[PDB]
Symmetry: C2
Amino acid sequence: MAGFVQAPLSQQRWVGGSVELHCEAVGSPVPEIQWWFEGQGPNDIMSQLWDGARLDRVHIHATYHQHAASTISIDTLVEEDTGTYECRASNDPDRNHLTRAPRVKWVRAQAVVLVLE
Amino acid sequence: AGFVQAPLSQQRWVGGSVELHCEAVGSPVPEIQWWFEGQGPNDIMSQLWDGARLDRVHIHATYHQHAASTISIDTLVEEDTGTYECRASNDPDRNHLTRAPRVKWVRAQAVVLVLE
């Protein structure tokens, strides 16, 4: 299984600033970490963030020696960066792809980021 | 509200016990709840309560400066296996006095596996 030894921390930032969130997890094998995001307002749903997202303002750096560590950074914040950021970790062999054995659950830990003008 | 410590996944034995811990900050000091979802595509997340499962589940919390909460489970059985979720919020409407603006609580999860 996979478990968190550090969760990302909620924070309030300013339009034009930056934010950095950190996540750490253990397991054997060493788990993979992904970052996911959900905006405000009942239209928005959780989707995966990727290195280079949002016009290359989002950056993800990860290492996997002995334990999983991952940092997500966002340049030059705008208001719509506001929302819930979620770190997910798993060492399930089928987590990528499958096959209709349909469904690895990743453990999740959340931080809310509020961007004010 | 944010977490400064999430619960940690662990593997235990039928007949054993487990203890999960959660810590969160905010101002006002946020409330913490624990929720649980079993394995197998039938199961959905539901709130755990102090005394649950025939009084095998106990929840102790304190809210001075920061929110700290511990859930303990006595005498484990296989169906205690699943995902345990700590939720935290300091939203004034979270104990949802009908007022229809749907508070989101921040969540942090640990998986507990109970093997025979």
